[PDB]
Scaffold this active site. Sequence first.
Site, PDB file in Angstrom:
ATOM      1  N   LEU A   4       0.864  -1.218   0.000  1.00 17.78           N
ATOM      2  CA  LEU A   4       0.000   0.000   0.000  1.00 17.78           C
ATOM      3  C   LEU A   4       0.885   1.248   0.000  1.00 17.78           C
ATOM      4  O   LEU A   4       1.533   1.556   0.983  1.00 17.78           O
ATOM      5  CB  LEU A   4      -0.884  -0.002   1.250  1.00 17.78           C
ATOM      6  N   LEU A  19       4.409  13.776   2.458  1.00 20.00           N
ATOM      7  CA  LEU A  19       3.955  13.722   1.037  1.00 20.00           C
ATOM      8  C   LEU A  19       4.029  15.127   0.422  1.00 20.00           C
ATOM      9  O   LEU A  19       3.973  16.108   1.135  1.00 20.00           O
ATOM     10  CB  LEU A  19       2.512  13.217   0.983  1.00 20.00           C
ATOM     11  N   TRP A  21       1.841  16.211  -1.955  1.00 18.36           N
ATOM     12  CA  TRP A  21       0.447  16.710  -2.151  1.00 18.36           C
ATOM     13  C   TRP A  21      -0.328  16.594  -0.836  1.00 18.36           C
ATOM     14  O   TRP A  21       0.117  15.958   0.102  1.00 18.36           O
ATOM     15  CB  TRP A  21      -0.250  15.877  -3.232  1.00 18.36           C
ATOM     16  N   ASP A  26      -6.850  10.351   1.880  1.00 10.16           N
ATOM     17  CA  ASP A  26      -5.823   9.269   1.858  1.00 10.16           C
ATOM     18  C   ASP A  26      -5.142   9.183   3.225  1.00 10.16           C
ATOM     19  O   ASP A  26      -4.725   8.124   3.655  1.00 10.16           O
ATOM     20  CB  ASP A  26      -4.779   9.580   0.781  1.00 10.16           C
ATOM     21  N   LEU A  27      -5.026  10.293   3.910  1.00  6.80           N
ATOM     22  CA  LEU A  27      -4.373  10.286   5.251  1.00  6.80           C
ATOM     23  C   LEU A  27      -5.298   9.614   6.267  1.00  6.80           C
ATOM     24  O   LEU A  27      -4.856   9.093   7.274  1.00  6.80           O
ATOM     25  CB  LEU A  27      -4.092  11.725   5.691  1.00  6.80           C
ATOM     26  N   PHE A  30      -5.228   5.580   5.860  1.00  4.90           N
ATOM     27  CA  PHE A  30      -4.037   4.885   6.433  1.00  4.90           C
ATOM     28  C   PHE A  30      -4.394   4.311   7.807  1.00  4.90           C
ATOM     29  O   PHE A  30      -4.071   3.181   8.118  1.00  4.90           O
ATOM     30  CB  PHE A  30      -2.887   5.882   6.581  1.00  4.90           C
ATOM     31  N   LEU A  54       3.086   4.589  16.512  1.00 13.71           N
ATOM     32  CA  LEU A  54       1.620   4.634  16.242  1.00 13.71           C
ATOM     33  C   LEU A  54       0.912   3.567  17.099  1.00 13.71           C
ATOM     34  O   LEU A  54       1.177   2.393  16.941  1.00 13.71           O
ATOM     35  CB  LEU A  54       1.371   4.338  14.762  1.00 13.71           C
ATOM     36  N   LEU A  94       0.153  -8.961   7.482  1.00 12.38           N
ATOM     37  CA  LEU A  94       1.390  -8.177   7.194  1.00 12.38           C
ATOM     38  C   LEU A  94       1.081  -7.102   6.151  1.00 12.38           C
ATOM     39  O   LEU A  94       0.526  -7.382   5.104  1.00 12.38           O
ATOM     40  CB  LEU A  94       2.474  -9.114   6.656  1.00 12.38           C
ATOM     41  N   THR A 116      -2.323   4.015  -5.004  1.00 14.37           N
ATOM     42  CA  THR A 116      -3.222   5.206  -5.034  1.00 14.37           C
ATOM     43  C   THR A 116      -2.734   6.184  -6.103  1.00 14.37           C
ATOM     44  O   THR A 116      -1.768   6.899  -5.905  1.00 14.37           O
ATOM     45  CB  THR A 116      -3.206   5.894  -3.666  1.00 14.37           C
TER      46      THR A 116
HETATM   47  C1  LIG Z   1       1.399  14.230   6.293  1.00 14.64           C
HETATM   48  O1  LIG Z   1       0.490  13.353   6.960  1.00 14.64           O
HETATM   49  C2  LIG Z   1       0.936  11.998   6.946  1.00 14.64           C
HETATM   50  C3  LIG Z   1       1.880  11.505   5.971  1.00 14.64           C
HETATM   51  C4  LIG Z   1       2.296  10.153   5.997  1.00 14.64           C
HETATM   52  N1  LIG Z   1       3.202   9.712   5.058  1.00 14.64           N
HETATM   53  C5  LIG Z   1       3.343   8.286   4.745  1.00 14.64           C
HETATM   54  C6  LIG Z   1       2.143   7.700   4.017  1.00 14.64           C
HETATM   55  C7  LIG Z   1       1.183   8.579   3.487  1.00 14.64           C
HETATM   56  C8  LIG Z   1       0.062   8.102   2.809  1.00 14.64           C
HETATM   57  C9  LIG Z   1      -0.156   6.706   2.629  1.00 14.64           C
HETATM   58  N2  LIG Z   1      -1.266   6.256   1.957  1.00 14.64           N
HETATM   59  C10 LIG Z   1      -1.499   4.948   1.771  1.00 14.64           C
HETATM   60  N3  LIG Z   1      -2.614   4.571   1.099  1.00 14.64           N
HETATM   61  N4  LIG Z   1      -0.654   3.993   2.230  1.00 14.64           N
HETATM   62  C11 LIG Z   1       0.484   4.330   2.913  1.00 14.64           C
HETATM   63  N5  LIG Z   1       1.243   3.270   3.320  1.00 14.64           N
HETATM   64  C12 LIG Z   1       0.813   5.734   3.162  1.00 14.64           C
HETATM   65  C13 LIG Z   1       1.991   6.268   3.874  1.00 14.64           C
HETATM   66  C14 LIG Z   1       3.063   5.373   4.470  1.00 14.64           C
HETATM   67  C15 LIG Z   1       1.779   9.273   6.989  1.00 14.64           C
HETATM   68  C16 LIG Z   1       0.833   9.754   7.967  1.00 14.64           C
HETATM   69  O2  LIG Z   1       0.285   8.911   8.981  1.00 14.64           O
HETATM   70  C17 LIG Z   1       1.100   7.766   9.234  1.00 14.64           C
HETATM   71  C18 LIG Z   1       0.428  11.112   7.930  1.00 14.64           C
HETATM   72  O3  LIG Z   1      -0.473  11.579   8.866  1.00 14.64           O
HETATM   73  C19 LIG Z   1      -1.739  11.645   8.258  1.00 14.64           C
END
Ligand SMILES: COc1cc(NCc2ccc3[nH+]c(N)nc(N)c3c2C)cc(OC)c1OC
Length: 162
Positions: A4, A19, A21, A26-27, A30, A54, A94, A116
């Site tokens: 993913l 990210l 964008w 999408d956030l 997760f 987390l 996993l 995505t």
């Molecule tokens: C800037 O905000 C955030 C950014 C990220 N970055 C990593 C991130 C982002 C989108 C994602 N979307 C999906 N579909 N799957 C993942 N594996 C994934 C990951 C790994 C991760 C966050 O939470 C862990 C977050 O908080 C919302």
Amino acid sequence: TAFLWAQDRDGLIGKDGHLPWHLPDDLHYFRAQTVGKIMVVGRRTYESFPKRPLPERTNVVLTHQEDYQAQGAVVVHDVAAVFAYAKQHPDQELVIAGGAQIFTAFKDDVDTLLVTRLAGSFEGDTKMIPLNWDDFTKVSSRTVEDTNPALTHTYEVWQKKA
Ligand SMILES: COc1cc(NCc2ccc3[nH+]c(N)nc(N)c3c2C)cc(OC)c1OC
């Protein structure tokens, strides 16, 4: 295993850890694809988190260095150790979220492929690895249009078949 990652048509996956964008939806997905299953991440993706570790989910870290340390997380140092822990816990699953080195690390024992795609173009610094799509098959999909055309994306769900 389940993959993913959020990547745009520009072959991007992230930028400066976070990210490039902004996709609040999408956030929020997760947290839905992390609770109940084991979240496997690398060292660059671990520190990339906001308030780690987390909770409400397992926090595994794959690293080949005896210097990295994680409080409240299963620091694994072998692919067999990650699969051995999943065997003891069949109720969980996993899931690979990153980084790019972690994906290719379990790309051999991969089964599902959740990608995505985003219509909005976004440039960063890290790209996604070359997955062998010539060995998978689509089964389900979920298109969603945000307020702005660029904020449009689709969750493609593929499944390995042999
Ligand atoms: C800037 O905000 C955030 C950014 C990220 N970055 C990593 C991130 C982002 C989108 C994602 N979307 C999906 N579909 N799957 C993942 N594996 C994934 C990951 C790994 C991760 C966050 O939470 C862990 C977050 O908080 C919302």
